[PDB]
Amino acid sequence: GFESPRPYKLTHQVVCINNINFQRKSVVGFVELTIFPTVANLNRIKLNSKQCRIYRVRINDLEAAFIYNDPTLEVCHSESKQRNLNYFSNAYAAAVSAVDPDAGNGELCIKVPSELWKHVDELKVLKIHINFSLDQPKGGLHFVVPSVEGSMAERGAHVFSCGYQNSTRFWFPCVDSYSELCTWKLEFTVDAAMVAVSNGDLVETVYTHDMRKKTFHYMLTIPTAASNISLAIGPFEILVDPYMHEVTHFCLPQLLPLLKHTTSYLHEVFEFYEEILTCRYPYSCFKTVFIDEAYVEVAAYASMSIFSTNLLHSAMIIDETPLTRRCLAQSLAQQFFGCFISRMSWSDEWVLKGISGYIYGLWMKKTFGVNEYRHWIKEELDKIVAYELKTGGVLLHPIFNPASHLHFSIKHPHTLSWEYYSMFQCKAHLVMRLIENRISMEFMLQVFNKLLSLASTASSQKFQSHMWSQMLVSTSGFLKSISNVSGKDIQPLIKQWVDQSGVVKFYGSFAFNRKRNVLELEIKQDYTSPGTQKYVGPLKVTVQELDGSFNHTLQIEENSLKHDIPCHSKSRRNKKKKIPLMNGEEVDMDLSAMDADSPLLWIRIDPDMSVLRKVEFEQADFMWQYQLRYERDVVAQQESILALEKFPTPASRLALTDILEQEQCFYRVRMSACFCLAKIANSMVSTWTGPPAMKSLFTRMFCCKSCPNIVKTNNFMSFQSYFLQKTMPVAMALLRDVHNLCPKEVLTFILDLIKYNDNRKNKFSDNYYRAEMIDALANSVTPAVSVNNEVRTLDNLNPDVRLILEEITRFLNMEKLLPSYRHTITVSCLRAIRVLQKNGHVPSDPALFKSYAEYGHFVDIRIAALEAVVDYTKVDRSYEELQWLLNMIQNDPVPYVRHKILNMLTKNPPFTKNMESPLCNEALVDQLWKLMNSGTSHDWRLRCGAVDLYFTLFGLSRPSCLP
């Protein structure tokens, strides 16, 4: 049951936009809302509006009086001397709650005229006609106007609606909540050479009487929220999908072949999401818009998605096809379960984010294989346990503070830190995988189909929300639908992993009792760490003995420590028979390293990742080597690679080398075995016999049979030896001689890989392989032996580093004339120049990176150069570079770059709270408090980034370096 927090119900909204002026960056328009009051004596009506100048408001064609105030413009007063962050977080939460449409509130308060009170008490319709104007919007709708001359279509100027969550208040007045569903009528009067893309279906396109402008009329009969309404106006090249004909793809001019190749996969994504769920795609059209200077890499609205043009690749670009493919896939998953089925509160957001991430993981499983699915699930679980042990924990479904261990309030999406938002979505889809583990996948897809079918029977009624609230899901409704389809309720699993905000830590060690033939496990939990919680459920453990692989369920109550499980025979060591594996197959194992008295080959605690856990198991090194070689699970091979770094014995070198030589191993395991072999080789110097590690293996796999030092000409058509070939010198460059310097046998090998590179014969580009070669050249740089702080001059230039510097100069200059893909070699060469500057080789001068960060280099070039400037101002304690970065945060045209500068200055801070630095003035505290209070008031993501930066630099209390 859904009861509105608003005293009115909104039925229909007309959004008309005229006079989109690109020179002056200005729009004019009106908005006409059709509300039905649910309570009599409505009097004031409270709507949401930011940055719009409200000209006049007429209610039922009668002139009404409005008052506007935004408390989130300046959160705390300018003349308050408070400088602690808890004060700002409480004031910011109160300010966002005072404009919240999820309460009854709002920023624009319109007073109902007196003569309509007899029209409002007996509950009859009210039609509110606001007309407004955006004069020059800061972060409302992004105007990308290039400075080439010509007409606005000839120079490539466009507008798009940017922002996250409820940010539609930034460009027209609305009820900007996900729970106020209404039908829509959208008119946009644009130039005759431009096209206006928006939500709904385009009913017509009429000309103006001078035929210089045309009006696009859109209609949206599926009741969506105001937060799902978008807009993209530009000189877009239109491409109808040749497979599905209601899907149109819009790109920027001169990028039509890239659009043709890139969006050619999307019909398979449509077919997948419509056959695992049994509902068809709910909207009547689908539109993909590719734009410049995007807010996020992929945004999903109702019947529309806005991607950045940096996803567009051609047919000869690999290492970008899977990333763009999965961006399209998660936009479509959010089309199904973020835009059609919406949110009932700010709680129950974990339901939608979990269903979107879970069905996108099912797509990844079918498309890229079960092994890529397991690797992705393991990397998300590691990312979560790292974040939750780092700071507090992520709390899905809080109850309204519920989480007081962290420096922001979780009551609203616009007060969350961006890393918390990312980890929120990540934990939501892993908890949905856990619900699939308890209640099987076919029942899970039946739950999702039951939600979609209720929403689509709801979506066709005309009753103003008598039935339109069946399109809003809640937690209680989701659990009730689960209990309807399965008969089991998941309330212990919901109580543990949703309502409780923690992950578990397992420390395991075993001992084999030879007398009674049992395996005594010893599993203890660390439940006193700040991020942890105590697990009391069951726990699966998989033991591989000589007779095969056996699963055991252990009951781990609070007082439990020793778990005795039984062991089988050892009669497959009496005769040589094959040892049967986890799957149905069996292999020949070399049992010379195994103990004579124990049959068990390896043990895995929680193999299926059925809890949110971090396992620290203490096996013997031969058990880790057997688990690396003969396991049929990629997460166990990865964890054995990760645990073999502590055992540098030559049997582990043989194990990793046998993994590296082995095709029919998953390629991301061999790419990890490269770096593990490099670390082991560095640890057993003065024992290593022959050549450096992986060199003979590289010449055996990727070089000519007649010439060992000449590499084969590039043929990248295998896509697994391409990735292994481009990752093996990067790990090989981490080799170090007893003198702690990279050997001149590996550096010469990398330089010969660079010289003899011929790419005139493959059908794929070479930009990522050459960029990884520059990364391998950067990995070999050891710190220089400066004497008496000698100025870095030609005489003290290392003879090794002169070759590296010549190569990166040649590569960067050739990129200036023949540019690659993603300026990947520019990014790699800027990263390598920063590596050479971090050691004492090149003079520590930020002027090169400051010229590449000037608004104009690839956004990738820009963020690489700004990363180099952030690293410089951390190491050299530069005041003027920090003022340069803070000025670039305040006034840069691209808001993604501002968010990225705040993000990089949070990750690599110039000082922490513990450090005494010269940069801890009262002036810097006043600048950052002014940046939290004012200055970042227009983005909701810059303000949370400024809160994160103030927390990283000065902590939760009063800045110490202050009177």
Binding site: L258, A315, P819, T826, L848, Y855, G856, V859
Partner: peptide, 25 residues
């Protein structure tokens, strides 16, 4: 300037064009 000369870094108006765009196809 005689030894190791670097071409100076020139910013663009649309950096993604020069970047992503393949040049040999």
């Amino acid at each position: 300037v005689s030894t190791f000369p670097l071409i100076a870094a020139r910013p663009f108006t649309i950096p993604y064009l020069t970047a992503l765009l393949p040049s040999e196809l």
